[PDB]
Design a protein that fits this description.
- Two copies of one chain form a homodimer.
- With 401 residues, chain A is α+β, with helices and mostly antiparallel strands.
- The first copy, chain A, has three domains: 16-120 and 147-157 and 261-275 and 345-369, Nitric Oxide Synthase, Chain A, domain 1 (Alpha-Beta Complex), CATH 3.90.340; 121-146 and 161-232 and 396-400, Nitric Oxide Synthase,Heme Domain, Chain A, domain 2 (Alpha-Beta Complex); 233-255 and 278-343, Bovine Endothelial Nitric Oxide Synthase Heme Domain, Chain: A,domain 3.
- Helix content of chain A is 32%, strand content 10%.
- Chain A contains ten helices and 14 strands.
- In chain A, the strands form six sheets. In chain A, strands 4-7-8 form a three-stranded antiparallel beta sheet, covered by helices on one side. Chain A has a three-stranded antiparallel beta sheet with strand order 12-11-14. A two-stranded antiparallel ribbon of chain A has the order 1-2.
- In chain A, a hairpin with a 2-residue loop joins strand 11 and strand 12.
- The longest helix of chain A is centred in the last third of the chain and has 19 residues, at 315-333.
- In chain A, 45% of the residues are buried.
- Chains A and B meet through helix 8 of A and helix 9 of B.
- The complex binds protoporphyrin IX containing FE (2 copies), the ligand Cc1cc(N)nc(CCc2cccc(CCc3cc(C)nc(N)c3)n2)c1 (2 copies), 5,6,7,8-tetrahydrobiopterin (2 copies) and zinc ion.
- The site of one protoporphyrin IX containing FE has 17 residues of chain A, from loops.
Chain lengths: 401, 404
């Protein structure tokens, strides 16, 4: 009923009553455990009501008439339209809760701090881009990054979704040239050709910042060049290895995830983008030396000076380390918020902790909390965790086309 | 699609379907309403079925499924369990029974070498003492002057209305950890509760750090006896680093052979209570679990101090600068001493190749992702970008209640 959750570093034995809330199921079954897998009217009121109780409880005003005369209002609204709309305050609480509820997210200690720009008063892709510059301008805060989420209108069935066509407001470009080899970012290959398709002058630099494809409910998407000025790019240097930056490397400073769906009390917003700040490894481990991506490992080391004739030689580790460090130093230098996998993990164990007090636990995808490198070297690694689907929650959806 | 688990490799974009999981006659903790994947600690008529489950595998493995040979092996255990209550396995039935447990077991990265396994049959051992002899014999084959082979040494099974053979020492090689007055420990924080028993069962401790414990060898309804390994058998690797000379001086040593020995091996509804198996290490085990864990040898601080590292803040990556070196230096030692060992990269490759191989024979492979992926440099390795399907198959090495 309530899974015993020993931590193995301290001997800390905790118990989860939060799961019993999760009213919506996942990939695992009694006989097999798909833990590691990457992807998956009558009922609307059901989720409305509950969420609205979720809400009022927060501000402790649960029960009181305001409560029930909103439960009055939403009950009727759907009973006469098919759908309902959330007040500002309501979606603020909800968008927050989605973050709080996302089990792949190590950066959760921070969920309280979140700006919730309300873009539901938008109807043109030409307003969209604007609503997004006001987002990027507020989050970048020219160094001191701040966590925020601009939310475009809800989906309603008689028509298309508003969508952002690229999977992170900022991404570098990808250019497969006869060779079957890519200049720039190989993830962002499929996307870049679409911008070429829907009219775009392409670049060729290792890191060319892209445009923006925004589509409004039924309508050919529209291209919008991000004012270069508004894109905080971080040069990349090594604190002790002078040879480095000659490599000509960098990364953007703002991680805005645009391709996800937001679910609140049943209502779903297809486009609702959001952006905190980077966790070192993300850039220097995955986004770089990872083959399926920038894949730098080899050079880094050939430079460094390490026997790639053999793996046991351990060049791949010694290389990451320095790239993963060469990132923090640059970032800390160029004075741009950034949190390292160690700094990160401690604080989550405090989240993990603080949450246990409030709610009776916190769902967490273990296989994802644990950093991409040096696992055993973080506290999270030695901590059993439970992951289950809650709500309001962030979900994936089909690539717009 | 195919009404079966669907397993993608997010590096080659390949897919594969698990058909084998519908073999698992054992459920785990996970329900579709939450996932306890992370979690560490997890008759007669209802024994007889467990048995038939086995034989059928044995036969449909020599490929004689259907024969009289088969249909009368089943018409004999039915006879044995009927009149006995238990049932003894035939010779090569067991040898099979072991390799399957290994093959079946979800947390073991080292399964490409799965059919190498030597089965030493010791189902005749009836003296607490004789046990020692076997074990000793094992180590010498297993050690092989350093060319470590794999192997296992089944001692007899349980009877309803008998005692149990048991090997107390969780592992056959355990470094003594003496509770200090400091409130601290000199030795190996893990092997304390056991060091503490050796003393109560009559062991005079030395007081080093890498003292080798003695074995506490139980035999049914007999208080365990105490045996010391002749040091010539217990091969030991001093630790140095290829560049950092000072490393050597840390005094750090470590032992070649892992032998797990407090695990119940279950074949066909049988229980082998003392059933100890060995192989060779994977560097990170020693250099990350053993020598770096905050609650073991935890050398990470001392080592970072020497490489002259800003251990004041985490954004110097001192920890990551250290482990890496410490993990390397551990490999560079078995290079040198000509002792067997496999590094995470090398190892995590064979796994895919095992996975690839196994997709053909069984059409599936049980894998406990968290345990398959190495405690340094996850993404750095192939296994990392691979979805996996954990589940309970038999033969099976089970966890077992410690005797006292
Ligand atoms: C403040 C800085 C933050 C850090 C350091 C952080 C950390 C992370 C990391 C490392 C991941 C895994 C990303 C990956 O490897 O794919 C993640 C996942 C996630 N994060 Fe954050 N996070 C932060 C803020 C946020 C914010 C502001 C939101 C938006 C409300 C958010 C929502 C999510 C969601 C929904 C996932 C699930 C990943 C998925 O299933 O695709 N995070 N978080
Ligand atoms: C050939 C050399 C081998 C290597 C390199 C290897 C590697 C590993 C490693 C690294 C682990 C996880 C260790 C941990 O983090 O605690 C493991 C688990 C395991 N291994 Fe092996 N292994 C080898 C041989 C064997 C053999 C010979 C057996 C016995 C037949 C075996 C049975 C198991 C079992 C049952 C587990 C998981 C048990 C559990 O904790 O639930 N392995 N293996
Ligand atoms: C806020 C935030 C903070 C932070 N430190 N890092 C990120 C970027 C990493 C990330 C976080 C959350 C979700 C995704 C999208 C992953 C994804 C999933 C699918 C199904 N398809 C894709 N193309 C991409 N990426 C975002
Ligand atoms: C052959 C072998 C090869 C190799 N590379 N590593 C090991 C050691 C890792 C291991 C493999 C299998 C089982 C266990 C035991 C886990 C355990 C359980 C309990 C109950 N207490 C413990 N202290 C440890 N440990 C053994
Ligand atoms: C196949 C595997 O499940 C997948 O690559 C996961 C594993 N763990 C991860 N952990 C983090 N932090 N980020 C990730 O993208 C992933 N990817
Ligand atoms: C709590 C945590 O899940 C557990 O202790 C696991 C994590 N991953 C591991 N992975 C390996 N290889 N070995 C381990 O002991 C562990 N410990
Ligand atoms: Zn699971």
């Amino acid at each position: 009923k309530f899974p015993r959750v020993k931590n193995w570093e301290l001997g800390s034995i905790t118990y989860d009553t939060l799961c019993a809330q999760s009213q919506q199921d996942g990939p695992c079954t009694p006989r097999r455990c798909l833990g590691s897998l990457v992807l998956p009217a009558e009922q609307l009121l059901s989720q409305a009501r509950d969420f609205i109780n979720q809400y009022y409880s927060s501000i402790k005003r649960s029960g009181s008439q305001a409560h029930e005369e909103r439960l009055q209002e939403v009950e009727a609204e759907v009973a006469s339209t098919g759908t309902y709309h959330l007040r500002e305050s309501e979606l603020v609480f909800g968008a927050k809760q989605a973050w709080r509820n996302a089990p792949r997210c190590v950066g959760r200690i921070q969920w309280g701090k979140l700006q919730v720009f309300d873009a539901r008063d938008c109807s043109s892709a030409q307003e969209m881009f604007t609503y997004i510059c006001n987002h990027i301008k507020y989050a970048t805060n020219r160094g001191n990054l701040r966590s925020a989420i601009t939310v475009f209108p809800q989906r309603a069935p008689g028509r298309g979704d508003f969508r952002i066509w690229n999977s992170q407001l900022v991404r570098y470009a990808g250019y497969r040239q006869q060779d079957g080899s890519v200049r720039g970012d190989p993830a962002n290959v499929e996307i870049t050709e679409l911008c070429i398709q829907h009219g775009w002058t392409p670049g060729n630099g290792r890191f060319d910042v892209l445009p923006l494809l925004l589509q409004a409910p039924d309508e050919a998407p529209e291209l919008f060049v991000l004012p270069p000025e508004l894109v905080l790019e971080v040069p990349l240097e090594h604190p002790t290895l002078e040879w480095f930056a000659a490599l000509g490397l960098r990364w953007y400073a703002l991680p805005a995830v645009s391709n996800m769906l937001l679910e609140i009390g049943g209502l779903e917003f297809s486009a609702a983008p959001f952006s905190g700040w980077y966790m070192s490894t993300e850039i220097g481990t995955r986004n770089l030396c990872d083959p399926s991506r920038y894949n730098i490992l080899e050079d880094v080391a050939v430079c460094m000076d390490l026997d790639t004739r053999t793996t046991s030689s351990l060049w791949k580790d010694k290389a990451a380390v320095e790239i993963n460090l060469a990132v923090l130093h640059s970032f800390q230098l160029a004075k741009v918020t950034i949190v390292d996998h160690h700094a990160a993990t401690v604080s989550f164990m405090k989240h993990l902790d603080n949450e246990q007090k409030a709610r009776g636990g916190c769902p967490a995808d273990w296989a994802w909390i644990v950093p991409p490198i040096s696992g055993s070297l973080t506290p999270v690694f030695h901590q059993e965790m439970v992951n289950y689907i809650l709500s309001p929650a962030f979900r994936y959806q089909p690539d717009p086309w």
